[PDB]
Amino acid sequence: LTDVNNKLNAINSMLHIYLPKITNMLSD
Amino acid sequence: LTDVNNKLNAINSMLHIYLPKITNMLSD
């Protein structure tokens, strides 16, 4: 029942890791 | 009631497919 929160947190972590790297690569 | 979990899993799969491809394209 609470696995939805776990997968949402995993999505949040993955997005917060990926997005700034993409922004920095675009700046470069 | 549980369709929220299904659509969240679909979002997770779509993001996990798309993001590394974008990173590789930026590297190229």
Residue environment code for A8-21, b if the CB has 16+ CB neighbours within 10 A, otherwise e = eeebeeeeeebeee
Resolution (angstroms) equals 3.0
Tokens of A10: 């995993």
Question: Which method was used?
Answer: cryo-EM
For residues A26 and A5, give the distance between their C-alpha atoms in angstroms, rounded to a whole number.
Answer: 32
* Cα B1 to Cα A12: distance, rounded to the nearest angstrom: 22
B16: contact with A, CB 8 A cutoff: yes
Contacts of B26 in chain A (CB under 8 A): 22, 25-26
Question: In this complex, is the C-beta atom of A8 within 8 Å of any C-beta atom belonging to chain B?
Answer: yes
Could you give the maximum distance between any two Cα atoms of chain A, in Å? 43
Determine the distance in angstroms separating the CA of A13 from the nearest CA of chain B, rounded to an integer: 12
